[PDB]
Symmetry: C2
Subunit: 109 residues, 2 copies
């Protein structure tokens, strides 16, 4: 299984893009343990958000996470060309288990 993410999203340089991540009451809707990751092609993933809305040290405030219902979202503001990347979500889902989304490719226009 997988969390549902749109294939694609886009926003303007300097503006924002928002990505959704839809699960169920047993994952996204059940806990406050949603993370987001950014990956450029061929590069290492990077954690952007954890615990729904927390940014790791060194991740700036232009990355914001939220959730409501069974859907989490990530908004990337102040868009830079280097924000063109794949973005994935994950959620805790009970036990010691996590489920991931299928990734959204962002284009920066």
């Amino acid at each position: 299984s997988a969390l549902t993410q749109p294939p694609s999203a886009s926003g303007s340089l300097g503006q924002s893009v928002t990505i959704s991540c839809t699960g169920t009451s047993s994952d996204v809707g059940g806990y406050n343990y949603v993370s987001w990751y950014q990956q450029h092609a061929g590069k290492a993933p990077k954690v952007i958000i954890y615990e729904v809305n927390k940014r790791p040290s060194g991740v700036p405030d232009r990355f914001s996470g939220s959730k409501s219902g069974n859907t989490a979202s990530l908004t990337v503001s102040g868009l830079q060309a280097e924000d063109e990347a794949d973005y994935y979500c994950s959620s805790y889902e009970g036990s010691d288990n996590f489920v991931f989304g299928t990734g959204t490719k962002v284009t920066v226009l």
Copy 2:
């Protein structure tokens, strides 16, 4: 001066879309008084969310709201053809004042 909203968003039938509403610490980021409105052009608006995440009586559970920092988000899940519409946000901004966004047009594919 308006709240910033993307001019467009889209999602697939039966799935989800999330749209954003970005203000400042004096409005969206200052209070828990974000509302969302749906309007099919030419027709009367309807309130979908108030107080960030509250649904008026008669609004289905599949519309949900959230915020983090200066950014509020509305998710429409289980998208239906009737969800193609303009969606506006507003926030309190002190005194007896409310400020609105410019609206996002959602398409349902």
